[PDB]
Amino acid sequence: ASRYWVVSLPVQNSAASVWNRLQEQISKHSFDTPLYRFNIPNLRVGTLDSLLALSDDLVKSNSFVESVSHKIRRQIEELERVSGIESSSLSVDGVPVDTYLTRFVWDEAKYPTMSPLREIVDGIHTLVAKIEDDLKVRVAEYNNVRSQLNAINRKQSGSL
Amino acid sequence: MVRFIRQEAEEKANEISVSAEEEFNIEKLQLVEAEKKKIRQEYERK
Amino acid sequence: HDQESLRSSLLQWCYTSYGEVFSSWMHFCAVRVFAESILRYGLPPSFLACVLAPSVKGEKKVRSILEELCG
Amino acid sequence: LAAEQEAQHIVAAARNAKMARLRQAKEEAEREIAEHRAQVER
Amino acid sequence: GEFFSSALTSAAAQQKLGFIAGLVPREKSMSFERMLFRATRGNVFLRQAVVDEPVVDPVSGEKMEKNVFVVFYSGERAKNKILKICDAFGANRYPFNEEFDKQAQAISEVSGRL
- Check residue A152 and report its DSSP letter: G
Kindly identify which residue of chain E lies nearest to residue D7, measuring between CA atoms: E16
Chains contacting chain A through 3 or more C-beta pairs under 8 A: B, C, E
Contacts of C71 in chain E (CB under 8 A): 34, 37
The CA distances from residue D21 to B22, B26, B31, D25, E58, in Å, are 9, 12, 16, 6, 53
B21–chain C Cβ distance below 8 A for any pair: no
Q: Which residues of D touch B (CB under 8 A)?
A: 1-3, 6-7, 10-11, 14-15, 17-18, 21-22, 25-26, 28-29, 32-33, 36-37, 40-41
Q: Give the number of beta-carbon pairs within 8 Å between B and C.
A: 7
Element (H, E) at A149: none
Chains contacting chain E through 3 or more C-beta pairs under 8 A: A, B, C, D
Chains contacting chain C through 3 or more C-beta pairs under 8 A: A, B, E
- Asked whether A22 and A16 are in contact (CB, 8 A), the reply is yes
The residues, ordered by sequence, that sit 6+ positions from D28 with a Cβ below 8 Å of its Cβ are B28
Give the resolution to one decimal, in Å: 3.9
User: Which of A8, A50, A88 to mutate: most C Cβ within 10 Å?
Assistant: A8
Contacts of D1 in chain E (CB under 8 A): 8, 11-12, 14-15, 17
| CA B40 to chain CA centroid, nearest Å | 25
Nearest to E20, CA basis, from E66, E71, E68: E71
Contacts of E34 in chain C (CB under 8 A): 71
User: Which of B7, B12, B31 to mutate: most D Cβ within 10 Å?
Assistant: B31
CA atoms in the 13 A half-sphere facing the CB of A100: 24
Nearest to E76 among A49, A51, A56 (CB): A49
| CA E10 to chain CA centroid, nearest Å | 14
- Asked whether A9 and A35 are in contact (CB, 8 A), the reply is no
The CA distances from residue A2 to A5, A65, A71, A79, E72, in Å, are 8, 11, 12, 19, 40
What is the rounded CA–CA span in Å between residue C66 and residue A9?
8
Q: Which residues, in sequence order, are bridge partners of residue E46?
A: E71
Decide if E38 and C71 are in contact by the 8 Å CB cutoff: no
The residues, ordered by sequence, that sit 6+ positions from C23 with a Cβ below 8 Å of its Cβ are A91, A92, A93, A94, A100, A106, A110, A111
Backbone angles phi, psi at E36, to 5 degrees: 60, 35
> In the 3-class helix/strand/coil scheme, how is A88-130 assigned residue by residue?
CCCCECCECHHHHCCCCHHHCCCCCCCCCHHHHHHHHHHHHHH
Contacts of C38 in chain E (CB under 8 A): 41
Quick count: other Cβ atoms within 10 Å of Cβ B15? 10
Backbone angles phi, psi at E62, to 5 degrees: -65, -30
Technique that determined the structure = cryo-EM
What is the rounded CA–CA span in Å between residue D21 and residue D25?
6
What is the rounded CA–CA span in Å between residue E16 and residue E43?
13
Backbone angles phi, psi at A101, to 5 degrees: -75, -15
The residues, ordered by sequence, that sit 6+ positions from E19 with a Cβ below 8 Å of its Cβ are E70, E72, E73, E95, E98
Nearest to B9 among E14, E16, E43 (CB): E16
Q: Which residues, in sequence order, are bridge partners of residue A6?
A: C51
Helix (H, G, I), strand (E, B) or coil at E73: strand
C44–chain B Cβ distance below 8 A for any pair: yes
